[PDB]
Amino acid sequence: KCKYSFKCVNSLKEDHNQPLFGVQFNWHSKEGDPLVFATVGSNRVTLYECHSQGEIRLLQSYVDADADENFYTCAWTYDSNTSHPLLAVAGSRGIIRIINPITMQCIKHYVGHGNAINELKFHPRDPNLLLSVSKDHALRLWNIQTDTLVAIFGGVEGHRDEVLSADYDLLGEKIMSCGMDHSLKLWRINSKRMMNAIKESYDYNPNKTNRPFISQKIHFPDFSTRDIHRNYVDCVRWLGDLILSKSCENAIVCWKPGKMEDDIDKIKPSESNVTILGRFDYSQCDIWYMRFSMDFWQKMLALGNQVGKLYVWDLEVEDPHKAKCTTLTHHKCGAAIRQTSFSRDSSILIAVCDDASIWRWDRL
Amino acid sequence: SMFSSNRQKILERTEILNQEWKQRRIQPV
Ligand SMILES: Fc1ccccc1C1=Cc2ccccc2C2=NCCN12
Known part of the structure; x- marks a missing residue:
């Protein structure tokens, strides 16, 4: 009964070669605007635009002053005043950093x-x-x-x-x-x-x-x-x-x-x-620390495994056996998939791995 | 059904969030 099908269009490795724990698409940007996502791992916070023909364009790279820091999560928001996009990051150090994604410059850091x-x-x-x-x-x-x-x-x-x-x-x-x-x-x-x-x-x-x-x-x-x-x-x-x-x-x-x-x-x-x-x-x-995710309309459910496979389910199907979609596999994706993020419109699916790799999956 | 009733709650609610998103202009990065 699942309908959804994907295509692995691209993959890249970040030269830090450290595990990528979190991935998030900015779902605050309006229609037509570029489809931007962030990756978090080690003391790095990297931003990417998604483009036609599986192109993943590197934008900026925040490198935390603290080398020991290992970021685990990140959340997108915006400034209620300016409408300016805002990104919050956190990890091992237990410090919440609020980053300006346009200058990739920290604007405030909450401790507690x-x-x-x-x-x-x-x-x-x-x-x-x-x-x-x-x-x-x-x-x-x-x-x-x-x-x-x-x-x-x-x-x-x-x-x-x-x-x-x-x-x-x-x-x-x-x-x-x-x-x-x-x-x-x-x-x-x-x-x-x-x-x-x-x-x-x-x-x-x-x-x-x-x-x-x-x-x-x-x-x-x-x-x-x-x-x-x-x-x-x-x-x-x-x-x-x-x-x-x-x-x-x-x-x-x-x-x-x-x-x-x-x-x-x-x-x-x-x-x-x-x-x-x-x-x-x-x-x-x-x-x-394997995190499942959903698309905005909560119709899709993605999850990654230790061997780089990518499970997807169609939530609109009642029995969770018949909800199962085709496991997204690539013989070059073998590292643990820590997290996945769908783009607001569901046309893109990104997976992050332990080998510092990003995997792009465009819906057919 | 249980499922049908819950999927509708998802629809009504996600629409509220979508209509809030549509009524907003967020700067590209
Ligand atoms: F740091 C790591 C080194 C190797 C393997 C896993 C981790 C790790 C990933 C992570 C991801 C999301 C939330 C919390 C975590 C976390 N908390 C402590 C350990 N850890």
Whole structure:
């Protein structure tokens, strides 16, 4: 029942020969505009334009002052004032860098996270609210307009180990987080407490006060489970009101909090139930930090493995067996595929590998 | 069905996000 077909049009290696962990297409650019994506790995942040006939044009290369730094994630946004594109990067050093993609010059660096940062996500509605998951067991929500730490998610009922991923729902009402503690927790940010916290962070101004901004400390999630996976949870994304998550278990599980017919906004924080709806089976992805992704309209699901194969599913198919598309393979792609990014229109698919290579796959 | 109802939520919502994107001009890099 899957329709989708791709073509490997191009591949290149970055001369640093260090693993590429993250890849992201800038989905903020408008129609007709160039299709730009960023790659992160080592102390490097490289930008690329996608052109006709599988041409991948190198634009700029940010090389971090810190040689020890190893970037793991990157998130695209824009300046709410100027409409100027903005890119946020983070890694091992646990420092969030806000880069001007046009000058490839850092504009601000947020510190606070006690350890490494594994994920970065911009709220789907507000371009200033940056979420970061950390090795320090907590989630930090930041206002990048007023340079404030809005909230710290964690504590008494937060993750008991390194948080590995997180995802906002389409509307930006809530976050689903996951980590080495095998759990998946839900944080509602549309609570009278959170919305007020966000509002307060916008009214905060240093040239009006001597006293610093007080972050909210959210010790209690609105849902928790360890009934989904038997090892670390390395990737989590929402599929509407449903969750898609994975472990080393060679499957992406589609589940939901509570009993099969319980509405997500009606489940109580003390809910013990969970409903496993389906599995996306694949192979040779028994290692950690392998991140699956989707296209804007959430019709496609891509995942890479340790041997350079690229699994794709058609999410519009109900049974996840018949949803399977042709595994994208290339006898020259044998390194582990850390992450993939579709272009906003789905015409391009990029994969990043451990051997410092980028692989381009154009839809037919 | 469960699936059909969830796919519609995806449509309605992603359209809200798309309509927000269309009403916006972001500078090329
Ligand atoms: F650094 C590495 C060296 C070799 C293999 C993997 C990694 C790595 C990749 C990564 C990617 C996304 C998020 C977090 C991570 C991460 N956190 C610690 C280790 N690590």
